[PDB]
Design an enzyme around this catalytic site. Structure first.
Site, mmCIF file in Angstrom:
data_model
loop_
_atom_site.group_PDB
_atom_site.id
_atom_site.type_symbol
_atom_site.label_atom_id
_atom_site.label_comp_id
_atom_site.label_asym_id
_atom_site.label_seq_id
_atom_site.Cartn_x
_atom_site.Cartn_y
_atom_site.Cartn_z
ATOM 1 N N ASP A 37 0.883 -1.149 0.211
ATOM 2 C CA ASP A 37 -0.021 -0.194 -0.056
ATOM 3 C C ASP A 37 0.815 1.320 0.206
ATOM 4 O OD1 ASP A 37 -2.535 1.138 -0.224
ATOM 5 O OD2 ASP A 37 -2.857 1.331 2.097
ATOM 6 N N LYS A 60 1.738 4.814 -0.826
ATOM 7 C CA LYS A 60 1.110 5.906 -1.530
ATOM 8 C C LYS A 60 1.442 7.244 -0.833
ATOM 9 C CE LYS A 60 -3.235 4.698 0.902
ATOM 10 N NZ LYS A 60 -4.800 4.537 0.599
ATOM 11 N N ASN A 108 0.130 7.433 3.022
ATOM 12 C CA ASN A 108 0.951 6.554 3.758
ATOM 13 C C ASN A 108 2.408 6.693 3.818
ATOM 14 O OD1 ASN A 108 -1.611 5.528 3.825
ATOM 15 N ND2 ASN A 108 -1.044 3.379 3.027
HETATM 16 C C1 G96 Z 1 -3.480 10.478 10.432
HETATM 17 C C2 G96 Z 1 -2.278 10.231 9.655
HETATM 18 N N1 G96 Z 1 -1.746 8.891 10.277
HETATM 19 C C3 G96 Z 1 -0.679 8.757 11.249
HETATM 20 C C4 G96 Z 1 0.079 9.619 11.802
HETATM 21 N N2 G96 Z 1 -0.166 10.884 11.810
HETATM 22 O O1 G96 Z 1 0.984 11.554 12.411
HETATM 23 N N3 G96 Z 1 1.646 10.569 13.174
HETATM 24 C C5 G96 Z 1 1.147 9.478 12.474
HETATM 25 N N4 G96 Z 1 1.504 8.171 13.113
HETATM 26 N N5 G96 Z 1 -0.390 7.521 11.414
HETATM 27 C C6 G96 Z 1 -1.421 6.728 10.717
HETATM 28 C C7 G96 Z 1 -1.629 5.299 10.367
HETATM 29 C C8 G96 Z 1 -0.992 4.520 11.067
HETATM 30 C C9 G96 Z 1 -0.359 3.563 11.280
HETATM 31 C C10 G96 Z 1 0.332 2.444 12.072
HETATM 32 C C11 G96 Z 1 -0.349 2.081 13.403
HETATM 33 C C12 G96 Z 1 1.852 2.752 12.263
HETATM 34 O O2 G96 Z 1 0.240 1.309 11.140
HETATM 35 N N6 G96 Z 1 -2.515 5.074 9.607
HETATM 36 C C13 G96 Z 1 -3.320 6.081 8.787
HETATM 37 O O3 G96 Z 1 -4.363 5.736 8.095
HETATM 38 C C14 G96 Z 1 -4.852 4.254 7.784
HETATM 39 C C15 G96 Z 1 -5.998 4.210 6.693
HETATM 40 N N7 G96 Z 1 -5.226 4.376 5.457
HETATM 41 C C16 G96 Z 1 -7.165 5.149 6.971
HETATM 42 C C17 G96 Z 1 -7.474 5.154 8.316
HETATM 43 C C18 G96 Z 1 -7.625 6.380 9.269
HETATM 44 C C19 G96 Z 1 -7.869 6.248 10.325
HETATM 45 C C20 G96 Z 1 -8.596 5.227 10.873
HETATM 46 C C21 G96 Z 1 -8.514 4.222 9.970
HETATM 47 C C22 G96 Z 1 -8.274 3.996 8.660
HETATM 48 C C23 G96 Z 1 -3.097 7.150 8.976
HETATM 49 C C24 G96 Z 1 -2.126 7.744 9.927
#
Ligand code: G96
Lengths: 321, 10
Positions: free
Chosen positions: A130, A132, A135
């Site tokens: 994934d 992108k 991410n």
């Molecule tokens: C808000 C930006 N963001 C951050 C982040 N921003 O500042 N410091 C950070 N670590 N970490 C994120 C993660 C992660 C992770 C781990 C646990 C490391 O795998 N996943 C994201 O999105 C997943 C998915 N694409 C859409 C989503 C979004 C929300 C709930 C369920 C699904 C967004 C992330």
């Protein structure tokens, strides 16, 4: 055991259809982290338990400068919580959206760090699947932090294959849009698309109709701006080779093909991994609670609260294991 | 600037 009220909840950084991500302060230390909070009910309903468990288990062992480190993984009766290092610089998506395009040099810097991380994961028999702009995130210094390991697969070495139709539509490698199985080269195609976006300022293929989009991915030739350098064109042509066997990085040497490509002629790969290279853009964050490199769409939102129901590969702590 | 993409599985 770690629980919900061990943290202060400050700002919404991102929202999904499974849950949300929030800027939190760890009460017992005063230190700032990002927390991804998923709802068990939605996960179980979508039959996405293995994937969510994978995400934790992979994070529990991985260690690399350009992968987001997991501090805690815990669960409540109805929620799953990942607590990870706060990337103050925000998403690469935010920056590319604001700046439209990056220079080849800047794109080269980010690509080199993504390649380093992909080499590492692939050496551990992990396929990320994934890659992108959403991410890929930047930390306070401006170095890449790959995030979201929800679609990782383990035990994938050499020409091992996978069967799950997953990823992100716009980034799907063409072979994933065919029947039967696909290999780890899909990650290098992923790199290709992000490299393409960073330098050409748009997706190589796009349509809001997926049927139209998947046809483009399989059938359509990529176009390059005239001003793009020949090795830039060569790299994008190689990474976005529709045939995974002919694709750059798709051979047995994996990352070595991409690393030796002429586009990265001026890159010492040991300097990359050791963080000896200087980020071209440094996030101008003025405090730890500074969320300027995240979208107002999310940060403006206030924070509300919407038996053995246990997930068996969570409850992790970086201090313990 | 493209719209936010969303990941998916099977
Ligand atoms: C808000 C930006 N963001 C951050 C982040 N921003 O500042 N410091 C950070 N670590 N970490 C994120 C993660 C992660 C992770 C781990 C646990 C490391 O795998 N996943 C994201 O999105 C997943 C998915 N694409 C859409 C989503 C979004 C929300 C709930 C369920 C699904 C967004 C992330």
């Amino acid at each position: 055991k770690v629980t919900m009220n061990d943290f202060d909840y400050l700002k919404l950084l991102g929202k999904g259809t499974f849950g949300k991500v929030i800027l939190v302060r760890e009460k017992a230390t005063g230190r700032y982290y990002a927390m991804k909070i998923l709802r068990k009910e939605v996960i179980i309903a979508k039959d996405e338990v293995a994937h969510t468990v994978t995400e934790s288990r992979v994070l529990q062992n991985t260690r690399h400068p350009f992968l987001t480190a997991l501090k805690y993984a815990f669960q409540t009766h109805d929620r799953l919580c990942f607590v990870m290092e706060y990337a103050n610089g925000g998403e690469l998506f935010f920056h590319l959206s604001r700046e439209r395009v990056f220079t080849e040099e800047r794109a080269r810097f980010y690509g080199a760090e993504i390649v380093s991380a992909l080499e590492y994961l692939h050496s551990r028999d992990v396929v990320y699947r994934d890659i992108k702009l959403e991410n890929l995130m930047l930390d306070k210094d401006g170095h890449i932090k790959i995030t979201d390991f929800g679609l990782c697969k383990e035990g994938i070495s050499d020409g091992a294959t996978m069967k799950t139709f997953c990823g992100t539509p716009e980034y799907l490698a063409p072979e994933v849009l065919e029947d039967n199985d696909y290999g780890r080269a899909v990650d290098w195609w992923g790199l290709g698309v992000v490299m393409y976006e960073m330098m050409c300022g748009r997706l190589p293929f796009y349509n809001q109709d997926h049927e139209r989009l998947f046809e483009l991915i399989l059938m359509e030739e990529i176009r390059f701006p005239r001003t793009l350098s020949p090795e830039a064109k060569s790299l994008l042509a190689g990474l976005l080779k529709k045939d995974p066997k002919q694709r750059l990085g798709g051979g047995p040497s994996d990352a070595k093909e991409v690393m030796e490509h002429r586009f990265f002629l001026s890159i010492n790969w040991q300097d990359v991994v050791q963080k000896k290279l200087l980020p071209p853009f440094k996030p101008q964050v003025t405090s730890e609670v500074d969320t300027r490199y995240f979208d107002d769409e999310f940060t403006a939102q206030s924070i509300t609260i919407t038996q053995r129901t246990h997930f068996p590969q969570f409850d992790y702590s970086a201090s313990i294991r | 600037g493209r719209p936010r993409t969303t990941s998916f599985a099977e």
